[PDB]
Amino acid sequence: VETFAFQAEIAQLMSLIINTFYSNKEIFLRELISNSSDALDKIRYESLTDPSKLDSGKELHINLIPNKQDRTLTIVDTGIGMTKADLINNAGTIAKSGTKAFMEALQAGADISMIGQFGVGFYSAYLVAEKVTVITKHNDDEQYAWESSAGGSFTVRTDTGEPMGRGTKVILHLKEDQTEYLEERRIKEIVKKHSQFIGYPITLFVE
Amino acid sequence: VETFAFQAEIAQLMSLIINTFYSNKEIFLRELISNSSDALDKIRYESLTDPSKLDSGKELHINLIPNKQDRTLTIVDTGIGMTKADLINNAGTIAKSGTKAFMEALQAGADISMIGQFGVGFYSAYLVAEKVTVITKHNDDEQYAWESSAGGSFTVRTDTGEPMGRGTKVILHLKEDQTEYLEERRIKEIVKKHSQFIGYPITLFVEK
């Protein structure tokens, strides 16, 4: 298990997301589904010139998996996935400018719901999750598990458990008071409200 | 000059964009600036592992160039650009599956303004333009010019004209009744409304 420090600005944004009073927490789902949609666009585009890129799975979809026993909400996509380098480097220098701009926007009166306009929508997961695990598989690399309970660090390890073929699984280990996001009617409402017209099928799993 | 036929679905999308009554045409600028921003993110991401990727130009910006004499609005970016193969792939879009999903969404009550969510935002240019010319230069290919007045075809040719170093120029040949998009105050209003949080400087050029 390798341990890494978040880029300073990402650590600052994470503490802002965890500590700022903001009731409209439900936007985390919109942001994650948006990232899933973008990753799906990427593999679909690559497959136009090289169809073998879909040998790891032809279905391009998003699955929402609530689990009340584990207190987890999992967002699965069969997108392009991330290599070990992207998985690490995403929390590095690339995200510095967008994070810096977002925190400046917030100081100027912008809303936390605008996070996605700064390319850092992923960190909205910390509005509802105490810990986030990212399982990912890109065609050019092995399966890796990224994990962080914030605190300025994250870990990356090889994931040998259950191979996924290709894509990303975002496992949200929900805060004790955020279990409404495990309720079928609540998830349906949020999807209809914020992600009604996504370019890929969204399947809400039953418990 | 090579001439290509659009696939049936992308042809149907362009025809819908041209013929459907939809007054909120100004979203074309948000969509093009969004594509420019994404192309700029791509080159900036690649510049970190390989700094030589910026030898073709270090400045990362978006320029809006109205020209009332030519009746054109040009959107210039110093993004990653597009290869010839990208241009032939419906100007780097997931046009086939994107159109299919977008058409299905429109039938389910979605608005034309949601086009960009389907990876076909570029074709919103046809809300205001009778013809679109795309001049592009990717680090891994030569400079090319893509062009289409819709009508089921597009052309791709090598562009030996003024080099751009790296990036994309989208030249909108405006419809006769869409000249408001050449007005300084109109462009400023649209940029403020739909693109205030763009991560790259947007420069609106002055005329005369």
Author numbering:
A (entry chain B): 17 to 223
B (entry chain A): 17 to 224
Would you copy out the relevant sentences from the publication that reported this structure?
We determined crystal structures of the N-HSP90-L107A mutant in the apo-state and in complexes with representative loop- (1, 6) and helix-binding compounds. However, the complexes with the loop binding compounds 1 and 6 exist in two alternate conformations after L107A mutation: loop-in and loop-out, with increased mobility as indicated by higher local B-factors. ITC experiments for compounds 1–20 reveal different effects of the L107A mutation on the thermodynamics of loop- and helix-binders. Although the binding affinity is marginally impaired for the N-HSP90-L107A-complex with compound 1, the thermodynamic profile is very similar to that of the WT, with a major contribution of enthalpy to the binding. This suggests that loop-binders do not change the conformational distribution of the protein upon binding significantly, or that the thermodynamics of the bound- and unbound-states of the protein are similar (the available crystal structures suggest that the unbound state may be in either loop-in or loop-out conformations).
Here we report the investigation of the role of protein flexibility in the modulation of binding kinetics and equilibrium thermodynamics of drug binding to heat shock protein 90 (HSP90). HSP90 is one of the most abundant proteins in the cytoplasm of eukaryotic cells, comprising 2–5% of cytosolic protein under non-stressed conditions. It is a ubiquitous molecular chaperone intimately involved in a variety of pathways, including cell signaling, proliferation and survival, and protein folding. The N-terminal domain of HSP90 (N-HSP90) contains the nucleotide-binding site, which has been the target site for drugs interfering with ATP binding and ATPase activity. The unbound N-HSP90 has a highly flexible lid segment comprising residues 107–14137.
